[PDB]
Amino acid sequence: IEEGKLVIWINGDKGYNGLAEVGKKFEKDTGIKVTVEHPDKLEEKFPQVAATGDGPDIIFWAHDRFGGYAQSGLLAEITPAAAFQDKLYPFTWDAVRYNGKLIAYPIAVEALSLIYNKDLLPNPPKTWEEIPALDKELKAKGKSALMFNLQEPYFTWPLIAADGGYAFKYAAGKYDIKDVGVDNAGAKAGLTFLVDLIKNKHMNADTDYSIAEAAFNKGETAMTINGPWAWSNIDTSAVNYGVTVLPTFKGQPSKPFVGVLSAGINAASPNKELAKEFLENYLLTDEGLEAVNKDKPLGAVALKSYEEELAKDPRIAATMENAQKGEIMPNIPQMSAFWYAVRTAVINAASGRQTVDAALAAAQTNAARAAAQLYDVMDAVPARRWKEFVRTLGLREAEIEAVEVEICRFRDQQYEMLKRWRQQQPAGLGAVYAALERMGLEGCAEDLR
Amino acid sequence: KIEEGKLVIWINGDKGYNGLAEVGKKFEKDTGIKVTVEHPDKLEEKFPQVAATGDGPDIIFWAHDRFGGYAQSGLLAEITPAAAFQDKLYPFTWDAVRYNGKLIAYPIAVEALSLIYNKDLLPNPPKTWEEIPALDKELKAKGKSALMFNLQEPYFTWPLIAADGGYAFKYAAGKYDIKDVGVDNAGAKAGLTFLVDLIKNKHMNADTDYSIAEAAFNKGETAMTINGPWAWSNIDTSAVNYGVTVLPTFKGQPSKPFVGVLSAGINAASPNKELAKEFLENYLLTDEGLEAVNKDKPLGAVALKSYEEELAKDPRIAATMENAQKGEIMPNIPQMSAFWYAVRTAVINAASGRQTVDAALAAAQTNAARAAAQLYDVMDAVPARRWKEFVRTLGLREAEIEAVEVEICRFRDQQYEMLKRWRQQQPAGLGAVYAALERMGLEGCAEDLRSRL
Amino acid sequence: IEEGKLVIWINGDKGYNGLAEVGKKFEKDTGIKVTVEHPDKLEEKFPQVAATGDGPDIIFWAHDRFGGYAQSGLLAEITPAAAFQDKLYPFTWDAVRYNGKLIAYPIAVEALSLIYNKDLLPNPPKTWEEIPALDKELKAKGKSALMFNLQEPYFTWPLIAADGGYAFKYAAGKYDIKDVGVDNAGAKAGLTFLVDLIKNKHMNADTDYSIAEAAFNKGETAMTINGPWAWSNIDTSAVNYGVTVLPTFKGQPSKPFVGVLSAGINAASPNKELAKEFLENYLLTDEGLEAVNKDKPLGAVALKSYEEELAKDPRIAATMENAQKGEIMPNIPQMSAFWYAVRTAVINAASGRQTVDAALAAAQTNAARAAAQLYDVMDAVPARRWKEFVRTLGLREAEIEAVEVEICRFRDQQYEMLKRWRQQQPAGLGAVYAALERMGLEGCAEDLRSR
Amino acid sequence: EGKLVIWINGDKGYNGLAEVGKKFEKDTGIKVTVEHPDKLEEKFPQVAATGDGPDIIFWAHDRFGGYAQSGLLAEITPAAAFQDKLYPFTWDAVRYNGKLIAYPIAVEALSLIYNKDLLPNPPKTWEEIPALDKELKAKGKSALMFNLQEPYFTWPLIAADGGYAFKYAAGKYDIKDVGVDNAGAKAGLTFLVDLIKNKHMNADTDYSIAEAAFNKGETAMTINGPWAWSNIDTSAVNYGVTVLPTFKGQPSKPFVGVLSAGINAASPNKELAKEFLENYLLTDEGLEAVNKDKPLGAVALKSYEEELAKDPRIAATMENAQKGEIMPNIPQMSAFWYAVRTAVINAASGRQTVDAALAAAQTNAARAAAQLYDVMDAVPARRWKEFVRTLGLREAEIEAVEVEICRFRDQQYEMLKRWRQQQPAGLGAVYAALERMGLEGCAEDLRSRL
Known part of the structure; x- marks a missing residue:
């Protein structure tokens, strides 16, 4: 990551040009040219690049993937002043908090x-x-x-x-x-x-x-x-x-x-203090959030000053009303x-296959059972490449052998290897999809998305 | 249920079953409380099923290692031997008859x-x-x-x-x-x-x-x-x-x-528990009583110090005890x-040569605490066509069976999930698996799964 | 098999006592002891014993199962005189014919x-x-x-x-x-x-x-x-x-x-002609078919003379009426x-699983496919005793190893061993059922026998 | 009609063949198009199953037996005098149920x-x-x-x-x-x-x-x-x-492998092909026009092999070919x-002793099932029915298996087994089907084992 400059990843369906224009206004007053990019599947490319100390400085995505990013520690902890936090709606800050620490800035609400x-x-x-x-x-x-x-x-x-x-x-x-x-x-x-x-x-x-x-x-x-x-x-x-x-x-x-579009900072970024200045002083302001709104609309915004002007539209006010009455998605x-x-x-x-009480009782039990998803991974990978897949995932050669010496059947072995592999490495860091693209099986990746 | 005012005892047939009847028969002369000594087959396995019903014998004799499972479902009464009586047995024998802080049985013989x-x-x-x-x-x-x-x-x-x-x-x-x-x-x-x-x-x-x-x-x-x-x-x-x-x-x-310790535990469902404690301590566990059983078929080294001193004169029995004291009680x-x-x-x-010593023991250390390989063995000991009858007979409740079926696609995957979940509503080992196969008329499958344990 | 004697197997739910007496008047006129025994699950033990030149001289069973016996050549060909065949209803003879040759005598109609x-x-x-x-x-x-x-x-x-x-x-x-x-x-x-x-x-x-x-x-x-x-x-x-x-x-x-209870005679029997005399001249007569009918009824009988007297019962007359309107089971x-x-x-x-035309379209294609029956065997035997099972079946060790060396996955190996075994031996000779009982897995046989 | 379209693989002198084929043009007027598409081996039977494809096909003799039994190559009828211009064992390589299927060109x-x-x-x-x-x-x-x-x-x-x-x-x-x-x-x-x-x-x-x-x-x-x-x-x-x-x-x-030229059974220009193959291709100038674009090694035609058997390497190749066997x-x-x-x-x-390994190979030598189990494990199980539809297995045939077969792997093999005699091996159907599923990877990795 290049020292002294800002690189930003935002999804291609957002006003990436408008954010570039907020960023060149940041260039005139500092000298810090920002380059905004909208790669494909950035949500999955970021935890891979960032885990080796590369990637962008700031990433924009839905707050729900940031819990996984923060769980392997790939996002810098922000500590904005209470005066800044009061400019945004409080429940939006709950969306970018993980183990007590704030990991991103709230931007938009849906x-x-x-x-x-x-x-x-x-x-x-x-x-x-x-x-x-x-x-x-x-x-x-x-x-x-x-x-x-x-x-x-x-x-x-x-x-x-x-x-x-x-x-x-x-x-x-x-x-x-x-x-x-x-x-x-x-x-x-x-x-x-x-x-x-x-x-x-x-x-x-x-x-x-x-x-x-x-x-x-x-x-x-x-x-x-x-x-x-x-x-x-x-x-x-x-x-x-x-x-x-x-x-x-x-x-x-x-x-x-409720989903909150958020701006997180790369834990490996050397420009962390510069990233916080662009977000706090240039992006999260009425003029900056409108430069992005007019490239492609954000809907309801986390910043109160600009939302009260956007609630002009009863549609945007309704979105916020329903958002304030609902949950942040965990x-x-x-x-x-x-x-x-x-x-x-x-x-x-x-x-009618289940009654309401039986359906919800089963969902109660199965909501905490992760096994169903590993069987899905197993049947998304051609069986002939199961152990190539499990190595490309990074399960260590010692644990593979520990399964093989004790588990007889082949399907049982891969389930044991996957079950053990998931306990050694938490979701979701795009590990499975990166492994499949690194095996020449992008079809399996797409079909698993 | 069981009979108050009588003592019923289960001991395996390869032990001094007659000699124990006679110390129990001398125990009647002083009370009138008839002992019936029985040596059923698969006694280890019939007792926890029968005992779970408030049934079974009053006292059970078996290797100490299987009383920990009995005691985890509460099928054995806590023993309260006198502190003076505890000094009559070798101290390490008492460690073999612990489960979560309480003593659950009397030690008799050591192997x-x-x-x-x-x-x-x-x-x-x-x-x-x-x-x-x-x-x-x-x-x-x-x-x-x-x-x-x-x-x-x-x-x-x-x-x-x-x-x-x-x-x-x-x-x-x-x-x-x-x-x-x-x-x-x-x-x-x-x-x-x-x-x-x-x-x-x-x-x-x-x-x-x-x-x-x-x-x-x-x-x-x-x-x-x-x-x-x-x-x-x-x-x-x-x-x-x-x-x-x-x-x-x-x-x-x-x-x-x-080290294996042959032990006498008392049924938690026995109403004559107090009557039982007297027979083991005062008639059986003394030089006179366990000599009557040694003479039907020998016990080897025994937990009671006084009588081992008469049996340790055979250097073979003394060696067994020496090796026992230096060894590790089987958990x-x-x-x-x-x-x-x-x-x-x-x-x-x-x-x-498959593994070097470090790889074999590193793998064994990881696999030593993982029970999955044993459930895949159970799955392959039962004909797949009777898998769902089997877990029902095990007592897995109908709601969790359905919770698995609705979420898991492949059938072999379903049966592992049902067994794995069943293993978590119910701890081993009370013979649930063996009773299930052997109530389905599949005694054969049981033996073939019983062969490996 | 003892030469100079007739041993016959009939199922225990039939008039085995009355049939003994047809055999005992056979004794007054012959000198040839006949013994009626009714083993259990005889249908499957007969081809096993018979494959080694042993077993009874005559066996009574439903005609449908003689086609398998007859395809492995375990039943002798009958050639009764045309005068004798005309005593039985013609469609009964079609039920005990296999590749042009007659393999048994018709007895009863169902x-x-x-x-x-x-x-x-x-x-x-x-x-x-x-x-x-x-x-x-x-x-x-x-x-x-x-x-x-x-x-x-x-x-x-x-x-x-x-x-x-x-x-x-x-x-x-x-x-x-x-x-x-x-x-x-x-x-x-x-x-x-x-x-x-x-x-x-x-x-x-x-x-x-x-x-x-x-x-x-x-x-x-x-x-x-x-x-x-x-x-x-x-x-x-x-x-x-x-x-x-x-x-x-x-x-x-x-x-x-239509099912025809039939009497076939062991191809390894030395008393083939003596068996044919007992069936043609003593059993398949009004007196003989009444001696067993009166122990336990046979229902409708293949013999015209005796059926005409049993058809007084409108219940038995109906069975024959529907039998003639139906089709002999192949x-x-x-x-x-x-x-x-x-x-x-x-x-x-x-x-509702399928529509009518889809269900029958599937049955049309699947009607000639035997594969589904081997997979049932695979899931009827516990996987840990599979190789004991295929050995007890008599699939030989070169054949087991040839599959294991080339086929990777376990069930694919299990199907390959059976498929190769089934091409060395046609169904149905009670091979699978005998093998499981010799393994102390009568239970598995019990439940696979249920189908 | 009025044209010859000819398929040869790119590792051969495809330009040199254009060069003699264009001389077949000057004297007749029937345009020949020499093309070297990729996966020619398997693209040919797909088009030919549709009455389509090239007029002439060039590839090793070993696979023309599969082409010819699904009836996709025309029987050739060379003159008896023409037949000696080639080495006798070469013709044994391109004969199928007594019928000759192609003309030999080169031997390896x-x-x-x-x-x-x-x-x-x-x-x-x-x-x-x-x-x-x-x-x-x-x-x-x-x-x-x-x-x-x-x-x-x-x-x-x-x-x-x-x-x-x-x-x-x-x-x-x-x-x-x-x-x-x-x-x-x-x-x-x-x-x-x-x-x-x-x-x-x-x-x-x-x-x-x-x-x-x-x-x-x-x-x-x-x-x-x-x-x-x-x-x-x-x-x-x-x-x-x-x-x-x-x-x-x-x-x-x-x-012994013989590179061969077969004629499409659905081609209407069959006589035009034999005119090009016998009179223009299989000649000293014609087989040389391709040889220096790319060498053929040893050639089936008698006069021209003596003409490169000068090279002791090619003479050795032919000696060993004559001493070995035509691959079936x-x-x-x-x-x-x-x-x-x-x-x-x-x-x-050491897994097997020599006699045990060869005893198993003796039994397994005629058993094709091992190839279908590989197909089952080359496609992700979760996309099996999409795969099987892309193969052209008909929907009634799929449902008939599912209705009767309980376990999942057994369903997959029964579908392949029933599919294989409704369409015999080998027409590259499995490899083409996987590529239309966005599974080139699985296709490539399964084509690596053949």
């Missing part, structure tokens, strides 16, 4: 909202409980009240959590993995309500993101649940739409997972196990 | 390996392992060998591996730290190097097993073997004139054979299975 | 019939199509119209074949294995009717032999489909019963498979693959 | 390569090599190093005393008559293992190790074909090519190579 067709419905329902009655009056007229993706628990979670569902308990400065909240009464109530919507033919268990978007963009349904990323396809659509707060359930607010690696156990729980409850 | 030497070929057996290579070359001039013993099961090689610092699990405060295993330390590392060097220097052959060594010693072809008091019977009918003595030292330190925890697995593989690979 | 509760139903339906209306009228009274085993295709086949279904075509003197008829329109129509009966809740896809037997004998349903073997359990039952012709479908008779070894392909098709069609 | 076989400076007189028999080897390992050298990983290089010795792959009787290869377990093969491979036991060769030597050692003067002899000659030319070593040593008095018998063009040779490769490597390493 959450799901209720999107309603103003023509088909000028006054959207404020409660989930109104929607069944609303739906019969409108399917008399060939329209339905609501369609949204029921295949990812990301879209179904706001309802399951409204009455008391939650992923992992966060008490002081840590997420208690021993405390899962998929089997509590509130979660059973939320998922029972969604399953009843399907049993009462108010929604179809097969609805996915494309079906639901299609229905809403061809005016076939009055409401959908989607994020600010979907606003553009409905803008090109002929539909006239509004964005507002998610409906309530049992009087309680729906709680969507940045810990076991969130993978959580998603797979829950997604399976919703699909089985919605299809 | 360990000894050095057995042919007096004609060798009137004065070597006192150190380091003498044996020189002893063997001088003696291969006459077509014989100095020493052969079983090199296949680590039970017979462990006394050398542990002499200089080897150990199974560290035992500190009445508990075995199962994450503190000691087969990769310098003493083990030295002990096994000496053993494989004996093989490299063609003083022993890596393939020698129990029958080859027993035959060779009993046919006068070798001067020394390592075996326990059970083998003495084949040596007596044999023409060989033999001596029994203390194992040789290694690097100045004693060889440490594993009563179930993870001893994983230990036996890993160490068996290490010794075999080090003796054959 | 087929499914419609069994109806005359109290709940004085006039049973003559057509399948009446049954949905009959079931609606009758479930008003908490009762069911018809329940029979839908797990095993033996009971479902009469309907699938009525309109044109058929197992393997029989043209000259053999069954054309490239010509299976489970994917034709008639088979689709019969199974479509069965699946519709379930969709319209006139039957449940889960009814099995024991559930259906209980339901009819506890008066809960008015009709079942079962064979003469089930008649005694309803006799002790309180149910008043009738036996009659199976219903028609699309105007055509339903066609049940005695060829591919019938294992066919039954297994067809079994899954019915169960999947009846449960 | 392994020879003994000896470094003349380190050894002026190479040993003429194998039994001399242990003694010759001791004198030279006194000087840090070895007598002989050659690839002991591929049975192609080990076979000449194994066959000297009576070994043989498949017996060729009438116009057919008898698949139940394999000769890798006879006394001659046991004697040849026992001699090979004894050379290894007596540390005269190392069981792990491979093609690059052996090539490097001989070209850096490290060893006095190697066994290799005419393809390796230029790397020895660029090497500073000056070498000689001669007849393989004898073993127990009989000649070493290397496999039948598909069961895949199973044969795999069974024999396992035998040699296990015999050389």
